[PDB]
């Protein structure tokens, strides 16, 4: 048997365990038979090329399936009334009533209604027909083929890069900051100014005419003249109808703030100046490190020099340079942590400040997008801590990290874990106590005895951003403040109009239920962090198993001796923290969906009165909103929700099977 | 739908022929010495 060709020990297994473990360790290249560092890095480079190609193929498939079976050209004309089509349905297991019930969107065949919001995104960035959608799908197929060929080529001899190229921190940082971040943002600003904004103003710009259709009537003469503010003059009127010239402006770079009054999304000129400014800032950031010409910073010197002279951090950041460059798991943990933070940021800022036209009125799309990117965020953060634990098992050299910041984390890990345990028990005891207190006192007919804490800190923050609801009269909600006078000519009117109109999700009003659910979220975040940090810091050893690093990151147990050692590895701490991650994203998405559903219904007081006790969550959110879902099919008939009605039960099944 | 024959041609192939051939060849690959 030679299926796991990368593992001789697995290939000699006489049982069915061989197939499973060969499947489960296939991409764990560091543990393979005879793996060298150079071969490892080259295989990782080609695999990264392959994942890039997969992403491009998936996006091209979305574009193609929309250009072929969607209703994009119908949806562009009437964006608030036409249901966007994801793809067609051809399922031979359907009966005729299911064919009838899925025939929606103004077409004559069964379709799925898109919830990904690709219509709003593609319409906002200037796509109008099915032809340019198809052309984009072809271009992304070509790009995926190019990246597949590059992955093949950069594995061929005399093209395989050396380890010195892979561990070139300064050159990769300079190029990825200035070019991959900066010039990409500048080019996207160029696309918005050159294409997206004219198509938003009823003017077609394509490859056939973009060299003769000026983005601005004055041309590049104000840019080369230094009279840049000419590009801010004559912005879009509040009577502008999106995608038409009626009420359109001529500005390409503004700082208006707030939302377009019709699309309920950010101004495209604001987005263009944003991405231009981000490009300039990032290109300036990408000239920081020394690569070939004497100027620039050395990363090793910066790390070694930043030791505080009071000695509280010990040796400071000495040895962190080699520890991070030599460990791909350290790099992966840092990358996954930063990505998880930023996709959480994407989820919060995109519902609060939508950028795509008419997507704030697509409630299903907003709910799906928030839930999707928050679950992605939870997965990424769990992965960051897991691969940090893997770094402590596999790549942490203590002798290379003497009195380092990493060594001092390991030296006060007991204090860290004990204080995390204390703050988790603190939060859980009193948050659950307040909820149960409210439940009991409302059940006994006395809701006036509830413990309802007003979230005055976050309300004060909202007032500091200009929310006049709470009467705090500070910073932007004070008409005489220096912060108010400072921004009054640039963005304060549009921002104040957007924050003080109760027609959006910009700084939504909050009460005691919001207080309780954020403190529950704080509990869940601290507890998941407790499990993950305790797994990472005890990964090398504990009092129960002082030689744990000899056994690797993942192993079943150390036997029933010494009291019993079930789930003692750091992998098991990943496994335990996965349930807590699911629990916290569940709480966060439950809060988001219930608050937004009650607000969209015009019944926000239902959330304000029912969220302070758990029975309100169970009855007014779970039980109340389950009725159309569980009636997708019934003994009287079926409708288009039936698939979700199936999938719901499907989920309730497989979850139980996990048990 | 333009080229409406393509779902009825490709969906049975992709859903029954592709997994059958993949499962057969993967079975042969993982069980051969």
């Amino acid at each position: 048997t030679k299926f796991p060709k990368f593992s001789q020990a697995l290939a000699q297994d006489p049982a069915t365990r061989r197939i499973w473990y060969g499947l489960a360790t296939a991409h764990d290249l560091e543990s393979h038979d005879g793996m060298t560092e150079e071969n490892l890095y080259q295989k990782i480079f080609a695999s990264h090329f392959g994942h890039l190609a997969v992403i491009f193929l998936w996006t091209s498939g979305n574009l193609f399936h929309l250009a072929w079976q969607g209703n994009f050209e119908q949806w562009v004309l009437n964006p608030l009334k036409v249901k966007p089509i994801a793809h067609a349905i051809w399922d031979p297991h359907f009966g005729q009533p299911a064919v009838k019930a899925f025939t929606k969107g103004g077409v004559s065949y069964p379709v799925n209604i898109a919830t990904s919001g690709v219509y709003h995104w593609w319409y906002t960035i200037g796509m109008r027909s099915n032809t340019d959608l198809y052309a984009g799908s072809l271009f992304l197929l070509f790009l995926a083929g190019v990246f597949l060929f590059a992955g093949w080529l950069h594995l061929q001899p005399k093209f395989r890069p050396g380890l010195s190229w892979f561990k070139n921190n300064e050159s990769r940082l300079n190029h990825h900051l200035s070019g991959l971040f900066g010039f990409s943002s500048l080019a996207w600003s160029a696309h918005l100014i050159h294409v997206a904004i004219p198509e938003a103003r009823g003017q077609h710009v394509g490859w056939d005419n973009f060299t003769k259709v000026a983005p601005h009537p004055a041309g590049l003469q104000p840019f080369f003249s230094g009279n840049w503010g000419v590009y801010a003059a004559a912005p879009d009127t509040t009577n502008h109808i999106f995608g038409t010239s009626e009420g359109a402006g001529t500005a390409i770079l503004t700082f208006l703030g707030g939302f377009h009054p019709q699309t309920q999304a950010l101004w495209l000129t604001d987005i263009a100046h944003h991405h231009l400014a981000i490009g300039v800032v990032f290109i300036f950031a990408g000239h920081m490190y020394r690569t070939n010409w004497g100027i620039g910073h050395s990363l090793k010197e910066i790390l070694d020099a930043h030791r505080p002279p009071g000695g509280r951090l010990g040796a400071g950041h000495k040895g962190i340079f080699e520890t991070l460059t030599n460990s791909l798991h350290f790099q992966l943990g840092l990358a996954l942590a930063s990505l998880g933070v930023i996709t959480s940021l994407v989820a919060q800022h995109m519902y609060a400040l939508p950028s795509y036209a008419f997507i704030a009125k697509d409630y299903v799309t907003q709910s799906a997008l928030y839930t999707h990117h928050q679950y992605i965020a939870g997965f990424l953060m769990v992965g960051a801590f897991a691969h940090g634990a893997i770094f402590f098992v596999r790549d942490y050299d203590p002798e290379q990290n003497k009195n380092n910041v990493l060594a001092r984390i390991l030296d006060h890990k007991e204090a860290i874990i004990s204080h995390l345990s204390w703050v988790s028990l603190f939060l859980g005891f009193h948050t659950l106590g307040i909820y149960v207190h409210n439940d009991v006192v409302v059940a006994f007919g006395t809701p006036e005895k509830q413990i309802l804490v007003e979230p005055v800190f976050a309300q004060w923050i909202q007032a500091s951003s200009g929310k006049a609801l709470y009467g705090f009269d500070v910073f932007l909600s004070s008409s005489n403040s220096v912060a108010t006078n400072a921004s009054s000519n640039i963005w304060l009117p549009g921002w104040l109009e957007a924050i003080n109109s109760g027609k959006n999700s910009l700084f939504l009003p909050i009460g005691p239920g919001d207080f309780l659910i954020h403190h529950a979220i704080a509990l869940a975040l601290h507890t998941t962090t407790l499990i993950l940090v305790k797994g990472a810091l005890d990964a090398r050893g504990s009092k129960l198993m002082p030689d744990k690093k000899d056994f690797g990151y993942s192993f079943p147990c150390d036997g029933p001796g010494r009291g019993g050692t079930c789930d003692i590895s750091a992998w098991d701490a990943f496994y335990l923290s996965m349930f807590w991650m699911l629990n916290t994203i569940g709480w966060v998405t439950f809060y988001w969906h219930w608050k937004h559903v009650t607000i969209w219904q015009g019944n926000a007081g239902q959330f304000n009165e029912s969220s302070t006790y758990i029975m309100g969550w169970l009855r007014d959110y779970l039980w109340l909103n389950s009725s159309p879902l569980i009636n997708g099919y019934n003994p009287f008939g079926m409708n288009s929700l039936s698939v979700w009605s199936w999938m719901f039960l499907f989920g309730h099944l497989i979850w139980a099977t996990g048990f | 739908m333009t080229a409406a024959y393509l779902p009825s041609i490709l969906v049975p192939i992709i859903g029954l022929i592709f997994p059958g051939l993949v499962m057969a060849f993967a079975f042969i690959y993982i069980e051969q010495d």
């Binding site: 080609a46 090329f49 392959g50 193609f64 072809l138 083929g145 060929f149 992955g151 093949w152 | 333009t2």
Partner: peptide, 30 residues
């Protein structure tokens, strides 16, 4: 809208990507 020829062109491009993906998979498999 999209024609049959355009779908065939997309299918040809996808077949080229399939050949390139098979070559990359064989290269990664050594």
């Amino acid at each position: 809208m999209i024609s049959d020829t355009q779908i065939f062109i997309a299918l040809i491009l996808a077949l080229v990507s399939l050949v390139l993906a098979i070559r990359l998979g064989r290269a990664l498999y050594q």
